[PDB]
Design a protein around this ligand. Sequence first.
Ligand SMILES: Nc1ncnc2c1ncn2[C@@H]1O[C@H](COP(=O)(O)OP(=O)(O)O)[C@@H](O)[C@H]1O
Ligand SMILES: Nc1ncnc2c1ncn2[C@@H]1O[C@H](COP(=O)(O)OP(=O)(O)O)[C@@H](O)[C@H]1O
Lengths: 89, 88, 89, 88, 89, 88, 228, 226
Amino acid sequence: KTAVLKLYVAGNTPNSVRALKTLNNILEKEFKGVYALKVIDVLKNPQLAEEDKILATPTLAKVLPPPVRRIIGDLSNREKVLAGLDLLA
Amino acid sequence: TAVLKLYVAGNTPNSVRALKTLNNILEKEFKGVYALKVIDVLKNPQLAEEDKILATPTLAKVLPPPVRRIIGDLSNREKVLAGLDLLA
Amino acid sequence: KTAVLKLYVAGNTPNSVRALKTLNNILEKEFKGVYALKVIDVLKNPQLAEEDKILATPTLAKVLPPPVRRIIGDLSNREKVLAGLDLLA
Amino acid sequence: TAVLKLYVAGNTPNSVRALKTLNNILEKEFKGVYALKVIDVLKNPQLAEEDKILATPTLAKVLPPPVRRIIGDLSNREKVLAGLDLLA
Amino acid sequence: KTAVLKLYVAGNTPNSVRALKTLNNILEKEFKGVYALKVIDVLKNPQLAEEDKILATPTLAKVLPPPVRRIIGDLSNREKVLAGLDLLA
Amino acid sequence: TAVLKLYVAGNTPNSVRALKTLNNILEKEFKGVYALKVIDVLKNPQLAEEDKILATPTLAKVLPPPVRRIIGDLSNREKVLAGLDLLA
Amino acid sequence: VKKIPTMIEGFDDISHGGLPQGRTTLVSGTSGTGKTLFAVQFLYNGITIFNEPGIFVTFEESPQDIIKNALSFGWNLQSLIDQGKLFILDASPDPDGQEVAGDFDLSALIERIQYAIRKYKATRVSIDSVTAVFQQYDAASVVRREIFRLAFRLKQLGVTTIMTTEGPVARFGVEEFVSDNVVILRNVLEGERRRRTVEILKLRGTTHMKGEYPFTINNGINIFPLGA
Amino acid sequence: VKKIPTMIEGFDDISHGGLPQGRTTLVSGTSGTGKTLFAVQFLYNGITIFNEPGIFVTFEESPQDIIKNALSFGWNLQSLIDQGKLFILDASPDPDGQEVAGDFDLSALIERIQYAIRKYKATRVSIDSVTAVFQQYDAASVVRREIFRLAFRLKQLGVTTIMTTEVARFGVEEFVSDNVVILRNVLEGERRRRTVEILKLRGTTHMKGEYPFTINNGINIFPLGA
Ligand SMILES: Nc1ncnc2c1ncn2[C@@H]1O[C@H](COP(=O)(O)OP(=O)(O)O)[C@@H](O)[C@H]1O
Ligand SMILES: Nc1ncnc2c1ncn2[C@@H]1O[C@H](COP(=O)(O)OP(=O)(O)O)[C@@H](O)[C@H]1O
C-alpha cells in the first residue's frame, strides 16, 4: 500500500528516454496504477541529485516500503525490473 | 506429517521472486506436497543458526527422504522443479 | 538381439532421479521394448559397483552386444543418449 | 524549420546500407520528422571538416534538442530507432 | 546500369560450389537479372588470376560501377552479400 | 561405373550415427548417386592402409571428380550434404 | 582518531597501540603462515585480558578441528566457552555441497553474525578465509558486495574485526580488495630456509610502523624488533 | 604555460612550480602508498593558504572516516566545510550495492561535480580512486567516455584537478592523461622506501626522476638544491 518509486534522468539523453519510454508502459500496462511518478532532470536541478547523493543516470526506484534497494540502467531488459518489482507478497 | 521449510530475508527482491515462484509451484504442480514455514531471519535468526544457514533465500526439506537444502532465487525453474520429487 | 544396458545410481540423489525419470521415458517412448533394466543403489550395495570398478554416478549402460563403451551423467541431454543407442544397424 | 543531416562516403556498401535503412525509417516510421542533407565527402569534405567529422557514415541532428551525432552502418536498427525520438 | 560482378573459383572444390550453388540462386531469385556472370577456374587458367593478382578462392565480385571493393568466401551467409550488393541507390 | 566408399570401426556409436545418417542421405536425397562399400577395419585393416586412413569413420569418393575424402561422425549434415554434389 | 590494543607478543608496538577500532582490518598471506592462528590468538588475548567477547567465523575449518588446532599451544576453549567466552560461527561448507536455482544475498550469514554479537556482548570478531567463500560459491560477483555489506555493518557497530585471506611479495591483494586497513603476513623462502615475516603496508588514517619485520611462533605469535 | 603551487613540503619544486593549471593531473600508486593523502592534503593546502575552496570526490573512503583520517594531522575540516570552504563529495558506493538493467550515461556524477564547483566557486578538485567505479561497474567501455568528458568539463571550468588510481607497472586501464605523477612504494631487501616519481607534464619545465619521501603532518620529500 502507498507504494513509492522515484526516478533520476539526464534531461533528454538518448539512453534515458529509451529508459522512460520503455518504463511508463511497464508501469501502466502490467498494472495501470500501483503508483504515479517523479522524474528528475539532473541537468538543471542537480542539488536534489546531490542530497540524495545518487551517482548515475538513469537511476531508478525507491526504497520504501521496505527494503532499501533499487536499480539503474537502460531499462530495456524488462525481465530484471519485473523481477525487481516487490509487493503482492 | 508432511513438512517443508523455507528461509527468506525480510522482503528482498530475490526472496519474493523465490516466494512467488515457490507458491506458484505449490499451486501449479502439486497443491500439497508438504506444509510450509517462512522465516524473516532478521528478527528470529537464532532459528537460522539452529538451521546453520549461511545464505538467503534458503529452501530446505527433511522428511520424506532425503535430508536436503538448496539455495537461491529459485529462478532456475528447471533444476528446482527437478529438485522436487519423491516416489520414495 | 538380446540387447543389454545396466545402470548405476546413488540412492535418490537429485541428479540421479533426474536421470532415471528422464531415462525410463526415453527407453519406453521411443521404443517400448528394446530391453528391461537394472538399477544399482551404490549407497547400500556398493561392492557390485566395486567389482565392476565403476567410478561415477549416475553411470549408464552396458557394453554387450559389441562394442565395449558407455555413458555417464544427468541424462537430460536426450540427443547424446539417442546418439549413443546402437542396434538397428 | 525541420532539420536532419547525413554524411556518406560516395557509395561505399556500409553507406548504402545506411541510406536504404535510413530512408526506409523515414518512410515507415514518420514521413517527415526532418528534411535531409546527404554529403559525398569525397568532393566536398570542407563541409565534413566544418562538421569536424572523423568517420563515415555519420548521421547527425541539431534542432529540435539535443545537438547530437551518431555514426555507423545504421544496421543496429534497435538503437537508432531508439535514437530518433523528440517529444520535446 | 550495366552493373558488373566477376568471380574466381577453384575448379570444383567443395567450398566453392557450395559458393556457386548458393550464389546463382541469390543472383537470380532476389532479382532475375541485374547482371550475368563469369566464373574462373584458377586451376587451369591461373594467369588471369595473376594479372588480376587475386589471392584467394572463392573470391567474389567487381569494382565497377564505383567504388572499388568486393568480397570473398563460402557465401553461405546470405546477409553479408545482400548487405554488399550496391545499386538501387 | 558409380563408386563411393566408406570406412567404419566395427560398431562404434559415432559410426552407426555415421551409417544411419549416410544411408538416410542416400535414400532421402538421391537413391543412387554411387554404390557403396563398408569396411570394419578391425579384421581387414590392410585395406585401410592401402587406403592409408588414420581416422574413423572415414567417408571417401574417387570418380566422378574430384578425388576426395572427408572424416567424422557425419553429424554436421549441412557441410556433408554440401559435400555431396557433382554436376561435372 | 581511534585505536585498540592486542598484546600479541611484540606486534602492538609496531602498530603503536594496536588495530584500528570500528574499522575493518584485512589480514592476507600465502597458505601456511598462521593467518587463522593470528585471528585466534588475537581474540583470545581480547577475551582473556580485556574480557572483550569474541566471534570466530570459519568457512574453511570445522570447529572441533579449530579447537583441536588451538589446543596445541595450551588453550582450552569449549569448557571455558561455557563461561560465555568466544562464539564460533560455523560457516563450514555443507559436505553435500549445494545446488543453485538462482542467486543469493548472504543476509543469513551477516544477520547471524550480528545476533551472535548482540547476544555475546562482543566487541571483537575475527573471520577466517574469505577467498574460500569465493571458492565456495562460484559466483565471484555478489560475494564482493555482501562481504562489503558485512565489513560496513561492522564499521557501523564499531566492533573491531579481522579478515583472513590467501606469490607473497609480488602482486598480492589476493582477489578481495574491499577493506580499510591491511596486514600482510608473508613467509619467504631463500636458499633453502624459511623466514616468517609481517609486513604492514599501511594502516589508514593512523600511525603504523615503517616496513616489514620477521617473526616466529610460540604459545601465541611472537616477534620483538625495535629496541631503543 | 602557467602552473599552480601545491605548497606541500618538497613536492612543489620537483614539479618546478607545482601542479599544472586548467589541466587534469593523474596521481597513481599501488594500494597503500598515500595517494588519497596527497589529494586531501592538496585541497587542504589550497584552501588554508589561498582560501581556494576545494571539492574532494571520494568513492573508496567514507566522508566521516576521511575527517577522522584528517584529525590525525590535527585538522578540522567539518569546521572548514561549515566555513563554506571545502566540500567532501560522497560518491561512496551504497553498501547495499547495485543491480543493473542497462547501459549508463554517467551524467549524474559530473553534473553533481560542476554544481558543487559552480556553487563553491572552487578552484581545486581531488578525485580519489576512479578505479573504485571499475571495482563498482563492470563496464570498462563507457567509463572511458565519462572520465574523458569529466576531465574535459573540468578544463572548461579551468580548475586544477587530481585523479587517483591504483609495482612498477603502468596505469591499469585508466587511459592516458595530459600530465601524470606516479608515486611508487618500493620493497627492497627487507625494508620499504616510499618514493615519488613524476612521469610527465606536457609543455612544461620538469624535474628528472624518482625522489625518496616520508610522512609527517603533510607529506615530506627530499629534493636537491644549492
Ligand atoms: N607447536 C608448533 N610449532 C610451530 N608451528 C606450529 C605449531 N603448531 C602450529 N604451528 C603452525 O601453525 C600454522 C597454522 O597456520 P596456517 O598453516 O597458516 O593455517 P591457516 O591458514 O588456517 O592459518 C601451521 O603452518 C603450523 O606450522
Ligand atoms: N600518523 C600518520 N602517519 C603517516 N601517515 C598518515 C598518518 N595518519 C594518516 N596518514 C595518511 O592517511 C592516508 C590515507 O590514504 P590511503 O588510502 O592509505 O592511500 P592509498 O590509496 O595509497 O592507500 C594514508 O596513506 C596515510 O599516509
